[PDB]
Design a protein that fits this description.
The PDB classes it as oxidoreductase. The complex is a heterotetramer, with two copies of chain A and two copies of chain B (358 residues). With 110 residues, chain A is mainly β. Chain A is built from no helices and eight strands. In chain A, 0% of the residues lie in helices and 31% in strands. Chain A has a three-stranded antiparallel sheet with strand order 2-5-7, with no helix packed on it. A three-stranded antiparallel sheet of chain A has the order 3-4-8, with no helix packed on it. In chain A, strands 1-6 form a two-stranded antiparallel sheet. In chain A, a hairpin with a 4-residue loop joins strand 3 and strand 4. Chain B has one domain: Methylamine Dehydrogenase, Chain H (7 Propeller). By secondary structure, chain B is mainly β. Chain B has one helix and 29 strands. Classes of the chains: A mainly beta (110), B mainly beta (358). Bound molecules: 1-(4-methoxyphenyl)methanamine (2 copies).
Chain lengths: 110, 358, 122, 358
């Protein structure tokens, strides 16, 4: 279920799910480096009926995973609301900015 | 008997040429610009643009500018962000201009990589992730100014009625105007009143740009305008793109470079889809609507062929649309656009097409 | 004699992998990439070296030596990809072999597209 | 929840396979995809820039890549290199400099190998003059250019000696190179002519035993080279075809198109009917299983359009690869049994390799 773009935590992912790339929803595949920064999503949990803040930390320094590409735009906003925006590379500040995959880490309730 | 030769120029006249920025997202370190003849769909050439290239054509039509990122060993080693100048006819590299290592890495919105109306400065978006606008002096071949005044803002809207002024959209819902000196540093700036509610009616960043004013569309199908006929920007809106029948089906805009203005007629073109709701703002066009900006009323609607981005040629009265891979050419000399042809497989993953200036 | 000049033929004919002189092409036809059968696309550089084919011309019934010069220094054109192997041989007959990059000795070895240059009668 | 890195491949080494994806459409972004052959799970990858080659260290601890960089990819200085990567962490460790003549080409096993003792990497060069390069792994140094191998092609290591290998030469024979302690050439020998280059050219891919190698030809004949002794002894041809096979024009086809199951002496070959000039790289209509001792075909099964294979001796497994999909076969019995298919393992791969276990 977490490999589906319809998985509720993936509501503002524009990228490849790391869980399809040898990582997991919350871990980078081997040899890919977590981004310290990210855009954040507000996604509705269908189980408990609540909305949660999800941090979309990219994994960086390897070329594109190419698996489970998702493009979901729930509550996503343009670059003038920069940390809600997913059309930029959140690997941008990494030692190496090459984009590999995206993680979907639950932060808390919205 | 025969010998292979190089050194050749693009076969088709400049007036026939369009530039399809293929991000090649699946292999984003090998992005490139595909050059096409829009009259017959012929592939004319390409310019390689490494990781997440951006592209524009010099206002004078002689040069192609690209912006990209390299590393010594691609996935490791030292980063070099650069603007490149390439010859438009030979499609050959001429020079590299160093940028600080914070040029925006992101999808090919027009407003991330632009130039002043006079062509003398390249104006680009930075994000480190703090935002600033970078200024590159074309004559010097040097980066000459970082506009930190634009922190918290996004994208570059050149003002077509001034040589070296542009606007950006800020997170207060207003516009910041920057007026450059002849050295490319900031001579003056001003901030508009709030144009739009960032929380309640966020706008798309893509302007529908006229000589002395810009129109923007919102997530909910409203239209806002910034008038820069004078030194201070005057803002207004919203008016709705939607009539009462449109409201039943929840029509809303969607796309990336999703709007355009035909300046002579005042006709604004917008990608639209029904069944609008939270999260549908990048959905492909079910339709293209054509709005008279003066009467604030739709004058036409045609099927959108799943387009996501567009561009307009003022002189030839043309609109191009792009679904990610295919380019459609429309004659827009009349209110209802007429489809002329489609160029299939122009790109793998392109959200930006541009005419060669003529 | 008309079949010896690709410039006179139908663009659809010469852009096809089955065009007679493309018989040992493994790559993208430069003619689909903004070049022609015998000219590199703008800003790509001819390879000084090549593998060579012998191709039958059904139109005049003679066999010809075709030199498969690549155009180099730009990324993959991606169009009209052909993989034909008539009379092609492994790397121990190196100049008959098309599974290596014939841009290998260029200033920039990035492979862009492949031309089919008529050397003459076999 | 907090995002962590530093992880190793999640599956045991014994389950790992390596699909070398050339990504020919975007050849500057080649990479190695690492899969679990037991369940088809994607485990990770290693980027390999332009036309990467890969092998795993004999000891299973490292991944070795060979690739080419340029300072600005399509321009600037060339750097040909071997890289050493940790097999479990899939992280870059070390770059070893090569002269700028490493082979650029399709991923035949024989262009990038290592000595039995694992101390030297042995690689094919082409300038376009061919030589073989020796790289001292320990020292991280290129140590020897074997120009004596000029006019030959590919590296066939000898599993019965620590630092010896053969190459196939344009005289239809084999050249044996025997390395000294330092990686320089100690001795060498040339075999008699094994095959007729003009009349019965062989595929370069060996069906490799512990002290013998068999080769298939364009016309379906089999040749052998024996290196149990001091000097190589050559034989053949014998035909893979019976009378019915000949009348249907069955011939071999593919790239890494053969394999040997050593315990049984079974040779696996990709075959297709209606063979003629120019079909030597056609996908397999069938896989044929030949008894090399009796010289008879003992099985034939659907080829699933495969082009390359590899064998695991200890688990009795054959993998086949059609360019994008990997098929796993149980080959413990004469007739292979298909266990599974991994769809979309690569975009353009002609080489798959098992992680070494013995
Ligand atoms: C650099 O272009 C890119 C790259 C990555 C992503 C993913 N958030 C979006 C745009
Ligand atoms: C560098 O690998 C390559 C590149 C190009 C070609 C095409 N002859 C074959 C192999």
């Amino acid at each position: 279920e977490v490999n589906s773009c319809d998985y509720w935590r993936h509501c503002a992912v524009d990228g490849f799910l790391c869980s399809c790339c040898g990582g997991t929803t919350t871990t980078c595949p081997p040899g890919s480096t977590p981004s310290p920064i990210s855009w954040i999503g507000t996604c509705h949990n269908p189980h408990d009926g609540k909305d949660y803040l999800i941090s979309y930390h990219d994994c960086c320094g390897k070329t594109a995973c190419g698996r489970c590409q998702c493009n979901t735009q729930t509550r996503e906003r343009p670059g003038y609301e920069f940390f809600l925006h997913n059309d930029v590379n959140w690997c941008m500040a990494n030692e190496n900015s090459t984009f590999h995959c995206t993680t979907s880490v639950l932060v808390g309730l919205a | 008997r025969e010998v292979l030769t190089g050194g050749h120029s693009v076969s088709a006249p400049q007036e026939n040429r369009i530039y399809v920025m293929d991000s090649v997202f699946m292999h984003l370190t090998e992005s490139r610009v595909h050059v096409y003849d829009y009259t017959n769909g012929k592939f004319l050439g390409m310019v390689p643009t490494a990781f997440n290239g951006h592209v524009q054509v010099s206002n004078d039509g002689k040069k192609i500018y690209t912006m990209t990122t390299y590393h010594e060993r691609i996935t490791r080693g030292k980063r070099s962000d650069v603007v490149e100048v390439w010859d438009a006819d030979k499609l050959t590299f001429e020079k590299e201009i160093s940028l600080p290592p914070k040029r925006v890495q992101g999808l090919n919105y027009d407003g991330l990589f632009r130039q002043t109306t006079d062509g003398k400065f390249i104006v680009l978006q930075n994000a480190s992730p703090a935002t600033s606008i970078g200024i590159v002096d074309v004559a010097k071949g040097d980066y000459v100014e970082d506009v930190t005044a634009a922190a918290g803002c996004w994208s570059v809207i050149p003002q077509p009625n001034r040589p070296r002024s542009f606007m950006t959209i800020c997170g207060d819902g207003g516009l910041l105007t920057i007026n450059l000196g002849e050295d490319g540093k900031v001579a003056s700036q001003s901030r508009s009143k709030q144009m739009f509610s960032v929380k309640d009616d966020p706008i798309f960043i893509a302007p529908a740009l006229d000589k002395d004013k810009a129109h923007f569309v919102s997530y909910y199908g409203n239209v806002y305008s910034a008038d820069f006929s004078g030194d201070e920007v005057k803002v207004d809106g919203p008016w709705s793109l939607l009539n009462d029948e449109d409201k039943a089906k929840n029509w809303v805009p969607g796309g990336y470079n999703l709007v355009g203005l035909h300046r002579a007629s005042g006709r604004m073109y917008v990608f639209m889809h029904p069944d609008g709701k939270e999260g549908t703002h990048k959905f492909p066009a079910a339709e293209i609507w054509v709005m008279d900006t003066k009467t604030k009323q739709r004058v036409a609607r045609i099927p959108g062929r799943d387009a996501l981005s567009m561009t307009i040629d003022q002189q030839r009265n043309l609109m191009l649309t792009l679904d990610g891979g295919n380019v459609n050419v429309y004659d827009i000399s009349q209110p209802e656009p007429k489809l002329l042809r489609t160029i299939e497989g122009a790109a793998e993953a392109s959200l930006q097409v541009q005419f060669h200036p003529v």
